Design a protein around this ligand. Sequence first.
Ligand SMILES: Nc1ncnc2c1ncn2[C@@H]1O[C@H](CO)[C@@H](O)[C@H]1O
Ligand SMILES: Nc1ncnc2c1ncn2[C@@H]1O[C@H](CO)[C@@H](O)[C@H]1O
Ligand SMILES: N[C@@H](CCCC[NH3+])C(=O)O
Ligand SMILES: N[C@@H](CCCC[NH3+])C(=O)O
Ligand SMILES: [Cl-]
Ligand code: NA
Ligand code: NA
Lengths: 517, 517
Amino acid sequence: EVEYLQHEDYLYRTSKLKEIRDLGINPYPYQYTDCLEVQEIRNQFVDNELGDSEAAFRKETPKVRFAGRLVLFRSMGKNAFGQILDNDAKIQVMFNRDFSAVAGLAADAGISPIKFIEKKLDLGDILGLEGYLFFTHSGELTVLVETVTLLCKSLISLPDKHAGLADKEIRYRKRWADLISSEDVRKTFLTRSRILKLIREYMDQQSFLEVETPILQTVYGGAEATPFVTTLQALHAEMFLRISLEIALKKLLVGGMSRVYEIGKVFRNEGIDRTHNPEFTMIEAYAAYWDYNDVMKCVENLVEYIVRALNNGETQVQYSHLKSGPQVVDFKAPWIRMTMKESISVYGGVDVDLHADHELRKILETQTSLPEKTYVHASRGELIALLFDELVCDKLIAPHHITDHPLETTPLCKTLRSGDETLVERFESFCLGKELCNAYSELNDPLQQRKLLEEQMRKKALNPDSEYHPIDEEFLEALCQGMPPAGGFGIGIDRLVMMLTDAASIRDVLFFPVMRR
Amino acid sequence: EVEYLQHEDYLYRTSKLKEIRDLGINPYPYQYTDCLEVQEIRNQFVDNELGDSEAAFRKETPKVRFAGRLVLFRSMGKNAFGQILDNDAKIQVMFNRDFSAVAGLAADAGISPIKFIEKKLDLGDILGLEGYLFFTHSGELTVLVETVTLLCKSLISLPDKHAGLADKEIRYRKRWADLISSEDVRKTFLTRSRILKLIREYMDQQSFLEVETPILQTVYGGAEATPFVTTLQALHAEMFLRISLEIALKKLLVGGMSRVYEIGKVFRNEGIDRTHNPEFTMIEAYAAYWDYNDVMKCVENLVEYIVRALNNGETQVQYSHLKSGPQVVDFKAPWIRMTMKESISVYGGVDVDLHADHELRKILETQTSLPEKTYVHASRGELIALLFDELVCDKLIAPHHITDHPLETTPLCKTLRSGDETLVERFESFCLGKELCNAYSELNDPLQQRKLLEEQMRKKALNPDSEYHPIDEEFLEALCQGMPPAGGFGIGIDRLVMMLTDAASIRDVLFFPVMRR
Ligand SMILES: Nc1ncnc2c1ncn2[C@@H]1O[C@H](CO)[C@@H](O)[C@H]1O
Ligand SMILES: Nc1ncnc2c1ncn2[C@@H]1O[C@H](CO)[C@@H](O)[C@H]1O
Ligand SMILES: N[C@@H](CCCC[NH3+])C(=O)O
Ligand SMILES: N[C@@H](CCCC[NH3+])C(=O)O
Ligand SMILES: [Cl-]
Ligand code: NA
Ligand code: NA
């Protein structure tokens, strides 16, 4: 049920439409040409020795044309004052009974321009303003309006400027009301767009080529996640939405492209929380002839570059929403490097290699809240990965690279070049307690790759709930063609944006996050 | 059934893995440090003074490191010559019995470096090369190799050069093989990446902000297309993949963002042909206070800019694949502009407003192959659009903007400012007989918007093949909040890429196009 259709404001505003048309005025006209942005006007004349209001009345000061939403209005008799919001910038306007005209309002109309402005316009209407600049004596840049043009008649009132909890929840769907009302929300989303641009700048300077690969595939992989499934009618075929970019980009390495990246939507059909939306944006990037130590430098340099460009060359950022209180994190490279084992000793208090497997499980029972089913029959590598999750991850506030993970954690990474085949040359980057990056010395031994994908699914099929996952033969054939040694990474871009915009929730960095009905 | 695992060449290549490893050489090593690109090497010394082969043997010429795939090889006794392919650039290599060492091959090994190169390496292997540059007597850039490093032992041969129908059809799946064997394929996809980068540069310069909006939504709209459907588990909810970008971006204009664009995947669950893939890339862009004439200029200027950047300032492009023979088209702005009615006269030979509806029907009956069901009861506006489809569209070879479409073709556009409410301020741009762009003076009268969507719903209720499609109430509520007058366009980027890379099919501009099983 659409409630506003019976609201008093909607009925009152719509009844003005016929009145305005009867005056010969189109309430939804076609353009407003030669229209400067309020912010460009500010930048052009704020540092400038403009006249006072009487100079504007004398038409001696600069004449400007601009447009925006009427967000404040006060009638003062012969004069009226208002505020126009244009694309995150505001400017004061002044209407005068003698000076101001309404476009399309005939001289022999039954209503004066100033009365039209008071009675037929409303807060929320979009207006085109042409007039003369001046400074109030308080220094407020103001426009004496010579001609006002109605550009859009709004039919509901402005949103409440200061949302309580319930209004905020609705504005995650009705995002336009958030963008109208909140300077902070507007700035968050402008910064997000700048971050995406800075990423492309950095990768391009490093000679990576940006590509696109399919979201809809007959397979899925390159991560551990439940997929979305859909039906292609033309071929009467089930398709998956990709859970990662990895396999497709690796095929491009085989194809001879030495440095590729993609910034794209990936889809994981799982739970929704402060750091998880089912549709999210990743960059994956791959450079032939690199290993994971090369990738580590690329990832920290990328993030430092973004932060410096946003914060006047500074590398420190304030984040306010951790349960432990406000933090300052420094993204200056190099970030801290630790092995997973080292991080469990330093932050967890457990030297993993001094304990047998049986002793590790007792620590998990006593020092964590993991259910017995999680660790009762897990392997040594799986137990180490669990100790990290529970005793370490939350403590990684400053930027950390965590290196050398158990082989169990992934089938797509080479093992340690030293010969230790129980650990892989993987790292995950953490900041503010949350995972930010995943990177490998990429596996390109086709026989070893097949064996790990075979051993993975035999283990994955041990759980009766994991959807069966057939081996991606096309990928193995591409590796037989020959993939160069390579180093690759994947960064959750929404999470990066949260850290850099002081966003408490991923819902704050997506225009339209997934919401309950 | 994987055929190559039973092929002789797979046995031959895999059998060398043990032999190479028994010599202490890792066939899949971890990196190749400080590796220059062959293109960068060519840029630096091709147009430069360089020594001859004897200078290289004296180690007086520039020393370089690079890597790539061995794609030609010929032994001449003590010398051997080959070609290395690195990301669409090639360089010749020379090996010599006394000068060239193999990384990790011991002196007391049982095989000589030259014999290892001849016998343990194969075409298709990925090699790291360190050596000295020189020019052959014929002037070809060559590297006398001081050390070769095996970076990847390929287990299958280079792709066959003899393409057929069966061969090239598999290449659309096994794209890595296509990329290795075909310079034209590599250049097509390199050009595609440049086009995307050029679009972003142009749009950014016009002050459009790049945004992302969601692919997965609870509604679909903004085009006439069958959607893909999927299921979001966490909410037990049916979702649609978007069929266009339009509604989400319009909501951002309501929110106060003056100029936005998105380059994103959209999904239309329909048929496959030379200009349709179910997943394709669109740019949509919206500018407040513009109309369709402003957009027309923006579109043709955007495309002219792209063409000039790719073609050293020229605006003419050759396209080879039309049934009418090769064409030259000129993307120079301004493009030809005609109304739909004018184009039916100029190209179709019909002057529509001299004819009654029943004469239009009789023209469709006798001059086209449309089934009678399509026109026997169609409205005048629908008859005009069918006359354009059948008698005009294929003849629009040079770039055209076709303006002022019947109202029936879309519910999202303003009618003509002249007061002719049977036509809308829409244009579609055509080149080489195909639609390139769709653009509007955007409809922002909420009452008129609801009326047109209701009329569409009433019409679709009569077609038993289409399921009920509820009106988007959130979109209508945003329009009530108030959208500025605006102009928007959507361009099919894959079709633009086809036109600028002389691609016969959309399958030639997607790395992994949708393929029958
Ligand atoms: N559902 C999700 N929402 C947001 N970011 C995610 C999600 N799942 C994973 N990520 C991010 O993607 C990266 C690569 O897996 C992770 O390190 C994490 O930052
Ligand atoms: N299935 C498709 N594949 C590729 N491009 C398409 C497809 N459908 C429409 N387009 C492009 O999208 C634009 C907007 O509808 C069209 O002008 C056309 O260029
Ligand atoms: N596909 C990985 C990112 C790249 C990992 C390194 N190859 C992920 O989703 O986590
Ligand atoms: N949504 C349109 C493109 C924009 C049309 C102008 N608002 C389409 O898919 O064709
Ligand atoms: Cl509250
Ligand atoms: Na016929
Ligand atoms: Na129907």
